Amino acid sequence: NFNGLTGTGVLTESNKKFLPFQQFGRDIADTTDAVRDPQTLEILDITPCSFGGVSVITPGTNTSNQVAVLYQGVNCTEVPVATWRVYSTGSNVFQTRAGCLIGAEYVNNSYECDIPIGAGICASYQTQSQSIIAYTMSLGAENSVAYSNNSIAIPTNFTISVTTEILPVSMTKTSV
Amino acid sequence: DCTMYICGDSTECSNLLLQYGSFCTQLKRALTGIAVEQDKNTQEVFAQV
Amino acid sequence: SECVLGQSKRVDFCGKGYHLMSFPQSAPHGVVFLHVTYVPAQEKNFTTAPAICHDGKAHFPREGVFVSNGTHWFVTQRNFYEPQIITTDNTFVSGNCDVVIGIVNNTVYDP
Amino acid sequence: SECVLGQSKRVDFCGKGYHLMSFPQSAPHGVVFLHVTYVPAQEKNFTTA
Amino acid sequence: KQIYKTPPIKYFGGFNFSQILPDPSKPSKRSPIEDLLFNKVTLADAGFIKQLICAQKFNGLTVLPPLLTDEMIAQYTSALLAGTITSGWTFGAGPALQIPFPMQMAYRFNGIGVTQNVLYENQKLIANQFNSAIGKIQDSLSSTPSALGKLQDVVNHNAQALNTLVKQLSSKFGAISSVLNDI
Ligand SMILES: *[C@@H]1O[C@H](CO)[C@@H](O[C@@H]2O[C@H](CO)[C@@H](O[C@@H]3O[C@H](CO)[C@@H](O)[C@H](O)[C@@H]3O)[C@H](O)[C@H]2NC(C)=O)[C@H](O)[C@H]1NC(C)=O
Ligand SMILES: *[C@@H]1O[C@H](CO)[C@@H](O[C@@H]2O[C@H](CO)[C@@H](O[C@@H]3O[C@H](CO)[C@@H](O)[C@H](O)[C@@H]3O)[C@H](O)[C@H]2NC(C)=O)[C@H](O)[C@H]1NC(C)=O
Ligand SMILES: *[C@@H]1O[C@H](CO)[C@@H](O[C@@H]2O[C@H](CO)[C@@H](O[C@@H]3O[C@H](CO)[C@@H](O)[C@H](O)[C@@H]3O)[C@H](O)[C@H]2NC(C)=O)[C@H](O)[C@H]1NC(C)=O
Ligand SMILES: *[C@@H]1O[C@H](CO)[C@@H](O[C@@H]2O[C@H](CO)[C@@H](O)[C@H](O)[C@H]2NC(C)=O)[C@H](O)[C@H]1NC(C)=O
Ligand SMILES: *[C@@H]1O[C@H](CO)[C@@H](O[C@@H]2O[C@H](CO)[C@@H](O)[C@H](O)[C@H]2NC(C)=O)[C@H](O)[C@H]1NC(C)=O
Ligand SMILES: *[C@@H]1O[C@H](CO)[C@@H](O[C@@H]2O[C@H](CO)[C@@H](O)[C@H](O)[C@H]2NC(C)=O)[C@H](O)[C@H]1NC(C)=O
Ligand SMILES: *[C@@H]1O[C@H](CO)[C@@H](O[C@@H]2O[C@H](CO)[C@@H](O)[C@H](O)[C@H]2NC(C)=O)[C@H](O)[C@H]1NC(C)=O
Ligand SMILES: *[C@@H]1O[C@H](CO)[C@@H](O)[C@H](O)[C@H]1NC(C)=O
Ligand SMILES: *[C@@H]1O[C@H](CO)[C@@H](O)[C@H](O)[C@H]1NC(C)=O
Ligand SMILES: *[C@@H]1O[C@H](CO)[C@@H](O)[C@H](O)[C@H]1NC(C)=O
């Protein structure tokens, strides 16, 4: 409550210049990012507290009920937990480029993506005995070819296949 | 012309309109983009030779 | 318009492979296609040379490639194994057997 | 799908001229193509029937 | 479907593909032209975690990261390049079939109404022209004033929209003040 600038946040020490007449900081959207102390004449930098969004990674309710929780850009150990937070504040906490993942392991293997997460990380419900794993996306099996100055590979048999395709053509009319 | 369409000539109407932030600029930018696209469209259809 | 009423030469437009036909079916607010394709299978590698020299001249195939199983040479199609004996009805002479690189020696048939 | 994986017979679709190949390259939020074409040059007129 | 890998020893009858194939020396494993393209375009916030304007967006405006990192896209591009320079276009239908490069170019001339003997007699000249064109394209891309107009524009438009949205906060809208706290 500096002189009436009622607010909430964290106060740190800044290296701003703040010529003697100047005593407030400002930027876009009229946010006071710095302030001069009324008594000791020390400059302080104001930063908003930690905040973010959460996401729930679950398989279908038919298959099971275990879930995992992803916090958006928190860097885990920095402020993972300050009711709903009964998840041991642990149990294989993993860190990714998108945030903090709680409730999943990290297998060194590679499979096809099931539930996209972000930055080349997926999750699934594989059976080791039931758990939620968070592997790395696999682009497919690597294959080699044997280019040479004199070599051809001509097929000797064939196959006839049928492939379906679905396209919308129109939508329901309406009047108001 | 937004400021002339909304307010004819009275200055206090303009003073009140400035309290609404940057709404005229968005419309002007969109209309200019539409005009430039319209000018460009009739070029690659014909100017092939 | 393009696939049902005629073959389509666009790659990966109607089905994964060489397109053959199509059949339409109706559906609530939609259409369903049944693209019928043609995919080669099974393989076998061989030895090749871009041209055949007979006597101071080249011999390029009319339509196909030169394939040798180890002793003899044949002409074949590009998508199904079908060797044939080299004759004068599969080759057209163009050159003097000095500029092409990789041309091997062999004899052709005169009917 | 049409130019990288096979020759294209559409006129003035992949490059100005008779198309031969193509090579893709990535870019931030975009793709870049390197169409390789074939353009005739030099002339000589003749008589025909 | 399957990530192809380039042959160990690179030689294709005279054609010089070293300007488009990946370079193992670079940490990111990207072709020189890809490196030039990356250096040409400028970005401010790429969605990476960093706990001036990019950091100011804490009013609910967040940028989520893309699913595919810009490292496996290079793998896809390299797979496409290897498949299209080793096995021709036959890998677009079923299993890839090996074919030497001069034969592929012979097919490609045969496909536009030119008989194949032309290449088998002008191979050296054609290879020299191809190499010269590939060499010149990099200089043309580097020294041009601004050829990546479209990507730059699509990058700039979103930043402009976000800046306008953020700046819209400090407007009275007819109220006493634009601060929610003092009122
Ligand atoms: C090219 O591929 C096709 C299919 O992939 C091959 O046709 C298949 O040939 C096998 C062996 O000749 C057949 O198996 C036999 O089936 C009968 C029942 O019909 C069974 O009694 C035999 O004991 C044996 O298992 C198979 O049925 C047949 N497929 C079809 C759809 O008819 C074909 O042989 C291949 N071409 C070459 C040259 O190998
Ligand atoms: C490559 O293809 C050629 C052409 O088919 C193969 O040559 C042929 O081989 C068969 C079997 O070895 C010969 O048939 C047999 O000939 C003997 C006489 O040597 C005869 O006693 C048998 O009753 C039977 O008819 C065939 O004559 C021969 N033809 C030619 C033109 O060479 C060759 O074997 C193939 N090589 C490989 C490695 O696949
Ligand atoms: C394919 O093209 C590349 C260039 O895109 C060729 O690499 C180039 O090779 C020449 C000859 O060695 C290099 O020139 C020399 O480089 C050394 C430094 O290593 C320098 O000290 C010399 O004064 C001279 O400039 C050139 O730098 C090099 N290009 C690059 C980008 O490194 C390659 O040889 C070609 N290969 C084929 C098969 O065509
Ligand atoms: C394909 O042709 C090339 C070009 O001649 C061959 O490359 C040479 O191979 C020999 C031995 O095979 C080496 O001593 C040379 O050093 C190679 N040339 C270069 C520039 O390195 C290649 O070997 C041939 N491959 C096949 C399978 O025949
Ligand atoms: C078809 O390809 C296969 C695999 O590439 C070849 O099998 C081997 O090829 C290597 C490459 O030269 C040889 O060193 C081996 O001796 C081959 N092994 C066998 C068991 O053949 C195969 O030779 C190729 N077919 C032909 C006709 O060359
Ligand atoms: C193909 O056959 C011709 C003739 O049958 C070969 O030409 C001979 O080449 C040798 C060495 O180059 C010379 O000493 C002879 O005088 C040539 N004879 C004639 C009639 O020209 C030719 O070398 C063979 N090429 C291959 C690749 O087998
Ligand atoms: C190729 O075209 C050129 C220019 O059209 C021809 O050159 C002239 O053509 C006119 C038209 O008949 C003649 O009256 C002139 O006498 C030509 N001048 C010369 C110097 O040739 C040229 O003749 C044409 N080629 C052929 C084979 O007719
Ligand atoms: C739930 O799963 C079981 C077995 O996997 C299946 O039989 C059942 O139909 C599923 N329920 C629904 C509503 O699909
Ligand atoms: C999280 O914070 C720790 C300690 O400051 C740091 O070592 C780590 O690099 C941070 N993680 C990220 C993704 O910035
Ligand atoms: C699993 O992956 C980690 C990641 O660096 C690595 O350090 C470890 O050696 C791997 N272990 C096995 C058994 O692959």
mmCIF file of C-alpha atoms in Angstrom, chain C residues 22 24 42 45 48 58 65 73 79 84 96 98 109:
data_model
loop_
_atom_site.group_PDB
_atom_site.id
_atom_site.type_symbol
_atom_site.label_atom_id
_atom_site.label_comp_id
_atom_site.label_asym_id
_atom_site.label_seq_id
_atom_site.Cartn_x
_atom_site.Cartn_y
_atom_site.Cartn_z
ATOM 1 C CA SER C 22 -13.832 -45.169 -57.682
ATOM 2 C CA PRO C 24 -19.414 -43.105 -54.513
ATOM 3 C CA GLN C 42 7.750 -58.562 -53.742
ATOM 4 C CA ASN C 45 17.439 -56.907 -57.630
ATOM 5 C CA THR C 48 21.833 -52.972 -65.416
ATOM 6 C CA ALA C 58 24.557 -47.666 -79.090
ATOM 7 C CA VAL C 65 15.161 -51.083 -69.096
ATOM 8 C CA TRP C 73 20.401 -59.584 -70.992
ATOM 9 C CA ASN C 79 6.526 -51.965 -63.020
ATOM 10 C CA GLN C 84 12.219 -60.485 -73.349
ATOM 11 C CA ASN C 96 28.513 -44.069 -81.952
ATOM 12 C CA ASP C 98 31.787 -43.540 -77.299
ATOM 13 C CA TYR C 109 18.938 -60.475 -82.736
#
